[PDB]
Every structure is written in C-alpha cells, then in structure tokens.
Write a protein that binds this ligand. Structure first.
Ligand SMILES: *[C@@H]1O[C@H](CO)[C@@H](O[C@@H]2O[C@H](CO)[C@@H](O[C@@H]3O[C@H](CO[C@H]4O[C@H](CO[C@H]5O[C@H](CO)[C@@H](O)[C@H](O)[C@@H]5O)[C@@H](O)[C@H](O[C@H]5O[C@H](CO)[C@@H](O)[C@H](O)[C@@H]5O[C@H]5O[C@H](CO)[C@@H](O)[C@H](O)[C@@H]5O)[C@@H]4O)[C@@H](O)[C@H](O[C@H]4O[C@H](CO)[C@@H](O)[C@H](O)[C@@H]4O[C@H]4O[C@H](CO)[C@@H](O)[C@H](O)[C@@H]4O)[C@@H]3O)[C@H](O)[C@H]2NC(C)=O)[C@H](O)[C@H]1NC(C)=O
Ligand SMILES: CC(=O)N1CCN(c2ccc3ncn(CC(=O)N(C)Cc4ccc(C#N)c(Cl)c4)c(=O)c3c2)CC1
Ligand SMILES: [Ca+2]
Ligand SMILES: [Cl-]
Ligand SMILES: [K+]
Ligand code: NA
Length: 806
C-alpha cells in the first residue's frame, strides 16, 4: 500500500507487504505504489525521436530520450540512432550470417528473447508478408518452420504455459482458459485473481529452470495495461543492467493479432493494421538491440500460441436440442465442450445416458462426444482431475453451447465475434508460427513443422541449462541449431530376449484350440527350419528389433513372413514386425482354416493363451497381429494362426482391424513402394499415456489371465524416396502410425453401418499418432538399427501424419 517506486521502476524482484510493488505485474494485482504511473509509465512526447529532439537536454519526464547521454543511460527511443546519428533501421540492413556471437564485454552467454504473439496463424507469414518487413526478415534470414503445431486445446493459457514448460496441459495443469478444479472447488479464468494462485500452475517453467541453475530470468507474464512500446523499452533497459544484475532470458508478449482476430475473423480487412503494428514493435526491438550492439549477440524466438478460425454465433450447436434434462449439466462451452454434473456428488447423474443422447443424433452434427479416455491419444488430454469425463470435440468453424440464452444476449442477440480458436490441434487454421534468429540458430534455414512441446528443451540448450523432465524429445530439434550442447543417445535396453527353440510336444497343450493342419519332402524341410531360426529376419525386421525399456520376460519368435517379441507376462506379442512389398498378393483365409488356432511348440502351455477362454467370453473374440491375408505362400499361412500371434478383439473392433489388414496394408504398400509394419497391443487403463504395469489391468478375457488391450497400434515405415522399395532404402525414412481405441462398439463412427470402405480409414486418420506416443505407451524403443543419424531418427519419431490439406 505505502512507499514509492523512485529508483525501482520495473524492478526484477517482487516485494511482499508492507511494501507496495514496482515490478511488471503490479498493475495486475492493483498493488503498485501510488507513484508508479508517474515514474514508471511515462508517455510524454511519445515513443520516437524527431530531428528537433536530437541532442536535446535530458528531460526526465519524457517517455524515452534523444539526449546525448541516452545510450549510456540505456533509455534512448529505439529510433534514436536512425534519426539522430545517421544509422539505418535494422530491417534495411542486408542479412549477414551470424557465425559467432558478437556480444559486448561482460556478456557471459547470448541472451534469449522470446517474442510471443497471441493468435498468430501460420498462414499470416505468407498472406501478410507485404505488411511485415521486420518479421519477414527474421523469417528468411534465420531458421523457420512452415508452421508449428500447438497443443490441445488450442487456447492461449494452455499453449503459453506449454511453451514455458515443455509439458502437455494434462501435466502442467493449465487444461483450458477456463477450468474448474473439484478438489479446490474453485474456477480459474483469464480475468480475475484466482489465476494468480500458484496452486494451478505445475511443472517447472523456463524462468524457474534458469534461476535454479544460476541464470537470471523473471516470469514471462505482462500486465495488459502496460503498452507495447513500454514493454520493449523495459526489456532494453534491463539489457543495460550491470553484468551481475542483468537477466539472460526475456519475454515480450503481444495480445495481437488475437484480440482483433476474434472481432474480425482471421482475414478480416481490419486485420492488416494489427499485423503492421506487431511488425513495427519487432522493428523497435531490433533497432533497440542494434543501438546496444546486441543485434548479432541475442537469440530471438518469434513464436505464436495458436491460430484463428472463422466462427460466428449462428454456427452454434445447442445441447438443449439434444438433452431433455439440460439443467442437470454444467458445460464449459465454445470451440471445445467439457460436461460435468451441475450438482457435485449427485448419485443419479449418468454420463452414459448423456453420451448416448449426444451420439450421432443429427446427420450434419458439428460435434462428437467422447469419454476423455477415448479421445485420440495424440491429444494427450485426459490425465488431470480438471478435465471433465465427458468431452465434446467441436468441428472447426463451430461452437457448442448449453442453451440459446447463453449465446443470444438481451435485447435481441447481435453477434460481434467472427473468429475463435481452441479446436483439435491438427486443424490447419489452428497452426501457428516459429522463427529463430541469432548466433545459435541456423542461417537461412527451413525446418519441418514441429510441436510446441519441443521448444522448452531447445530454449534450455540456448541458455546452457539442463531441462527439467518434460514431454519434448530432446535432440529432435537439434537440426534448428548451429551449435548443439545436447548429444542425444539411445536408451539402454533393460530386458534381453529369450530365443526359444522347439521345446514342447503337441500333446502337452490343452488349449481347447483346433486347426485343420495335418494335411500334406526334403527340400522345403531345411528351408522351414532356416525361417524359424531367423533367415528372413533382415527382410521383416528392417530397423533392428525394438528395445524393451523395462523389466520383463519375453521371447523372439521368427517366421517366414513376420518376427515378433512375445511377452510371457501378457501372453501376447509386445510387437509384431513384417514387410509387405509393392508386389505382394492378398489372399483369403481358406474355408478349412476359418477357426484355426495352433499351439506354438516353442512356448510353454503355461505361457500361452487358450481358445476356451474366448469361447466362454461371450463379448470377446480374437484377431491376429500378423495378418493371414498377407501370407507369402499357403504353407507360410499356417504360421499366422499360431496361438502366439493371437490377440483379444471385440467383434466391433475386428471390423476395423480386418479392413486395415486385408485392404489398407496392401494399399499403403502399393502407394509407398512397400511398407514395413510393426503392430501390437497397448494397455493404458489409467489413461496417463504410459505403459501399464500388469497390476493396473482392469479387464481380462473371461476366466483367464489374458489381459485386454485398451488400444492397438501400428507403425508403418517406408523409404522417403519412394522410387526405392521399403526393404532397399538407402536414405531417410517416411512413417505414419496410429493408436486405435479397442472399443466394443463403433459409436464413434456415425457411418459404421456402411461398408468399412466408407468409415474405417476416417477413424484411423483421426487416431494418427507419433512413434514417440507409442513408445511411451509400450516401453519400447524403435529404429535402433538404421543408417541414419540419431537426431534424424528422433525427428522421425516425433513426426505426426495429420491428413490435412495445404
Ligand atoms: C510428460 O512429462 C511429464 C514430466 O516428466 C510426465 O509426468 C511425470 O510422470 C511421472 C510418472 O507418472 C510422475 O511421477 C510421479 O511423481 C509423484 C510426485 O509428484 C509430485 O512431485 C513432482 C516432482 O516435483 C519436483 O520436481 C519438479 C521438476 O519438474 C518441480 O517443478 C517441483 O516443484 C518439485 O521440485 C511434481 O512434478 C508433481 O506435479 C504434479 O502434481 C502437482 C500437484 O497435484 C500438479 O501441480 C502438477 O501439474 C503435476 O500434476 C500432474 O502429474 C500428477 C502425477 O504426479 C497427476 O496426478 C496430475 O493429474 C497431473 O498430470 C507432484 O507435485 C510421485 O509420488 C510418484 O511416485 C509414486 O507412484 C509410482 C508409481 O507410479 C511409484 O513408483 C512410487 O513409489 C510412488 O508410489 C506411492 O505413491 C502413490 C500415490 O502417488 C501410491 O498409489 C502408492 O501406493 C505409493 O505409496 C511418481 O513418481 C511425475 O509427477 C510427472 N510430472 C509431472 C510434471 O506431471 C508425463 O508422464 C509425460 N507424459 C507422457 C505422455 O509421456
Ligand atoms: C505461475 C506463476 O508464476 N504465477 C501465476 C500467474 N500469475 C500472474 C500474475 C499476473 C498476471 N498478469 C497478467 N497476465 C496476463 C498475461 O501475462 N498474459 C496474457 C501473457 C502470458 C505470458 C506468459 C504466459 C506463460 N507461461 C502466460 Cl500463460 C500468459 C497473467 O497471466 C498473470 C499471471 C503470476 C504468478
Ligand atoms: Ca498407463
Ligand atoms: Cl477452455
Ligand atoms: K467369444
Ligand atoms: Na456407429
């Protein structure tokens, strides 16, 4: 309450009561000293030097200075050298490679300045290029991606705090712009004081990582009323502090273009000016750095949080059109929906009835309901008590609301928003920007699109920090950097495989299985043993066997057409690997073999599944990981019916799996010039995105110890140069992968009553995944043996095939 900001303007360490505050957040708290506006928010004469001000006598009342002592004081207007000393604007200088940091004496490391822009959609870089010369120079001279993928939901606070932490929102806890925490019994909103409480904010953001390791860094937050020109001048003044006091990491935040984009839509004619204004702010920063002789010293990152889509009030779905009992729910509305019971601890609120009432009710329905554990695993949006059990994924360009009165406000509801964001993070309009410029970034370099979760590790590298544990894959963005301080290495294999031979006679098994395999030589007798010993393994295991990164007991099983790693604990393969060439032939399962399952004489009865359990379980059927349809010969096809290739499958899911195996695998082999497929089960009953231990499994095949997978994955690899076949590729690889939910119905697919050709591939595309997602869910490590660099393989493992257009 009481005291003064004299000598304290934008102080870096925040003070507690009794003392009032003078730091860059005091306005948000209504806790600034009474003279903060007078001393710290000077506006007199605006932000630019003019010719008549050059060499003026210093007037301490001015916003910034054009007096001769201003460089020494560190408080010149940013254009001072241009107007008063014949210098050129940074933007007017030619791009010149920054091979080494060119820093003043006393600089122990290149500072990092993070320039974050709210709502800056990726395509602004092309579509607004004529009005953003400073930004276009950073982009073309530095390192840029064509776009950067935000996290879900594609909202401001979840994405900004992901930038700062390298964590998914479910881990850092900022799961939306609005949230309710049922343990706190409290709500977080963009406006208000509740968000000030540290209890909402988990993980370890960069400013804390830096400070713990002796690198000075304040928080990245800004009070909204502090104008942009003053934020830039404040950063430039901090950069003028003595070496022992000066931060090494800085954050500028702009509320634009998002603020205007909501009002005018992403490409409204009103959007040109906010793009020009952000560009001018970038120019002020670069000119100011150039004055301080820091423009070839500092690393600058120009980064957005999310993009912006066209969304209008008339494109609103109302839950009151679907639910008779809409007053029994609370909805977090908008470009996503989150539903919970209106009254806490209510015994007779049924999420299953709500889901049903919201499922495929109108043909053009513009949202889909999910239990959060059923959302695509790529969204990583479930493991937090602030995420409601019922989630509505809203179509791009749409909103969901509970009742019409929520949207059309009195008198009679006019709209007055035309843009919004928050949709699925694969949606093109939600993609945002990344540019890195400075001595540590590459020169004039384009990099592929990547996810914002990866940036925290890079920012730690840029500062010489060890990153806190996060969801980036450290090394996957080494290709952005001229000088890398991190050398990634493969995780050590924890469990070594057994390689069993023929150890059991047929009569030792009592599995209740049958197969018509007795029917029908010395030439093909040796060839069989060779195949069982691994003679075709270099064809079907193209990138080495996967490493198992936890303690377990498993066997490598070789066959003519496929190899597998068979878990004696889970009684099924952890992975099955097989290559299908462009020329491969699809065949049927012969009539006489429809219900064939065969004991595997390499694997004990005690470590085998059994057909009786499947007969008895009236809900559960089975399928096979290596598909019998893709056998190389009628004789090799018998290997596909081994009990060691069988996995539990609901009949509903078998429709999906059989279409993938019979139709799609061969299609991809045709289109990609062969594919290598690795398939397997995933168990994630606690929806944490991580491999379950055996004591976490909640469902088994009835009367057995056969665990039921929650999902089934495949990783489908080929040669990036598709003129070379998958099995003879000399260069970089191409991958697409999926994690399909193992569900007892196809309620997710509204067209599922149609032939699989009309709906299965759409479902698979929705559940596209990165190899890294499968690695977390399985405890396996892939691509152990390739001819490619490890950094390149880490980039491959973070790739997501999105299926969007351009
Ligand atoms: C994405 O990356 C992240 C980060 O690597 C991955 O998330 C990590 O996942 C780990 C495994 O699940 C998990 O380990 C837990 O940790 C428990 C301790 O957790 C607290 O302390 C953490 C460390 O804090 C310190 O270091 C950090 C540096 O990062 C500093 O910032 C801190 O200030 C500290 O110095 C802390 O990060 C963690 O934060 C969570 O909880 C906070 C308060 O609720 C939230 O504010 C915050 O947002 C985090 O919330 C997330 O994570 C929790 C789970 O921790 C989750 O519930 C939330 O929904 C949200 O997702 C805490 O403050 C530790 O007790 C655990 O050990 C128990 O379980 C294991 C078995 O799983 C046993 O081996 C062990 O013996 C022990 O068992 C005993 O206790 C059990 C009950 O806990 C009991 O049932 C049992 O019977 C036993 O008695 C375990 O190690 C990390 O916490 C987690 N980190 C984060 C930030 O989320 C994530 O998995 C990656 N995702 C993917 C898909 O790969
Ligand atoms: C964790 C912690 O140290 N806390 C909790 C938050 N507290 C706090 C106190 C005051 C504030 N004034 C203003 N704004 C608005 C704002 O800063 N924007 C919109 C930009 C922005 C920048 C970086 C991140 C990031 N990362 C985020 Cl998400 C948002 C606040 O968000 C704000 C927050 C400070 C103490
Ligand atoms: Ca799990
Ligand atoms: Cl939200
Ligand atoms: K059955
Ligand atoms: Na359906």
């Amino acid at each position: 309450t009481s005291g003064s900001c004299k000598g304290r303007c934008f102080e870096l360490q925040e003070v507690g009561p009794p003392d009032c505050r003078c730091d860059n957040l005091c306005k948000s708290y209504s806790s600034c000293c009474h003279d903060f506006d007078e001393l710290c928010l000077k506006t007199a004469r605006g932000w630019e030097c003019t010719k008549d001000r050059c060499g003026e006598v210093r007037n301490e009342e001015n916003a910034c200075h054009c007096s001769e002592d201003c460089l020494s004081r560190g408080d010149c207007c940013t254009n001072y050298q241009v107007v008063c000393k014949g210098e050129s604007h940074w933007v007017d200088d030619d791009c010149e490679e920054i091979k080494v940091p060119e820093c003043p004496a006393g600089f122990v490391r290149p500072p990092l300045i993070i320039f974050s822009v709210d709502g800056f959609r990726a395509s602004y870089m092309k579509k607004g290029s004529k009005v953003m010369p400073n930004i276009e120079k950073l982009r073309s001279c530095g390192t840029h991606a064509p776009y950067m993928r935000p996290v879900y939901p594609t909202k401001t606070f979840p994405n900004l705090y992901t930038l700062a932490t390298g964590l998914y929102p479910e881990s850092h806890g900022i799961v939306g712009n609005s949230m309710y925490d049922p343990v706190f019994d409290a709500s977080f909103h963009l406006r208000g004081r509740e968000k000030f409480n540290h209890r909402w904010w988990g993980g370890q953001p960069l400013w804390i990582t830096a400070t713990k390791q002796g690198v000075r860094a304040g928080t990245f937050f800004w009070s909204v009323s502090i104008p942009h020109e003053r934020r830039i001048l404040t950063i430039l003044q901090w950069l003028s502090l003595p070496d022992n006091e000066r931060p090494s990491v800085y954050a500028f935040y702009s509320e634009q273009p998002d603020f205007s984009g909501h009002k005018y839509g992403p490409f409204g004619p009103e959007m040109t000016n906010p793009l020009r204004e952000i560009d001018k702010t970038v120019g002020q920063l670069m000119d100011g750095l150039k004055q301080l002789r820091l423009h070839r010293c500092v690393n600058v990152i120009f980064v957005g949080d999310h993009g912006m889509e066209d969304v209008t009030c008339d494109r609103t779905e109302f839950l009151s059109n679907y639910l008779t009992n809409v007053d029994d729910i609370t909805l977090v509305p908008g470009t996503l929906g989150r539903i919970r019971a209106k009254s806490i601890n209510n015994s007779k609120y049924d999420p299953k009835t709500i889901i049903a009432a919201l499922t495929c009710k109108k043909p053009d329905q513009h949202f889909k309901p999910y239990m959060k554990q059923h959302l695509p695993k790529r969204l990583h949006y479930a493991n937090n008590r602030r995420i409601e059990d019922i989630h509505l994924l809203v179509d791009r360009r749409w909103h969901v609301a509970r009742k019409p009165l929520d949207v059309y406000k009195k008198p009679s509801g006019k709209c007055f928003f035309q843009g919004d964001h928050g949709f699925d993070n694969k949606v093109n309009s939600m993609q945002t920007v990344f540019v890195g410029y400075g001595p540590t970034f590459k020169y004039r370099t384009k990099v592929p699109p990547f996810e914002n979760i990866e940036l925290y590790n890079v920012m730690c590298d840029l500062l010489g920090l060890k990153p806190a544990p996060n969801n980036g894959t450290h090394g996957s963005l080494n290709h952005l950097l001229r000088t890398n301080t991190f050398r990634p290495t493969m995780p050590d294999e924890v469990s070594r495989p057994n390689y069993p031979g023929i150890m059991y006679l047929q009569s030792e098994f009592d599995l209740g299985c049958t197969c018509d395999d007795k029917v029908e030589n010395k030439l093909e007798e040796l060839n069989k043993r060779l195949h069982t010993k691994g003679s075709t393994k270099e064809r079907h295991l193209l990138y080495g066997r996967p490493a198992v990164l936890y303690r377990t007991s498993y066997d490598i099983l070789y066959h003519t057409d496929f190899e597998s790693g068979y878990s004696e604990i889970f009684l099924m393969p952890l992975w099955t690997s097989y290559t299908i060439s462009k020329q491969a032939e699809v065949s049927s399962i012969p009539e006489h073999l429809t219900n064939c399952v065969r004991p595997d004489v390499r694997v004990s009865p005690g470590f085998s599944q059994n057909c009786l359990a499947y007969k008895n379980d009236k809900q559960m059927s089975y399928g096979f990981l290596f598909p019998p349809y893709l056998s190389s010969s009628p004789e090799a096809k018998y290997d596909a019916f081994l009990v060691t290739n069988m996995v539990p499958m609901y009949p509903a899911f078998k429709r999906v799996w059989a279409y993938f195996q019979r139709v799609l695998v061969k299609k991809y082999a045709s289109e990609r010039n062969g594919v290598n497929v690795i398939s397997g089960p995933i168990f994630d009953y606690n929806y944490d995105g991580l491999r379950d231990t055996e004591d976490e499994i909640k469902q088994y095949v009835e009367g057995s110890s056969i665990p039921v997978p929650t999902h089934y994955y495949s990783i489908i690899t080929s040669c990036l140069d598709f003129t070379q076949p998958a099995d003879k590729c000399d260069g970089p690889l191409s991958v697409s992968s999926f994690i399909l939910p193992h569900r007892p119905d196809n309620d997710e697919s509204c067209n599922s009553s149609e032939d699989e050709s009309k709906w299965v591939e759409e479902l698979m595309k929705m559940h596209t995944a990165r190899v890294r997602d499968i690695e977390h869910l399985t405890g396996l490590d892939f691509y152990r043996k390739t001819s490619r660099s490890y950094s390149e393989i880490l980039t491959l493992k973070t790739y997501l095939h999105t299926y969007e257009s351009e």
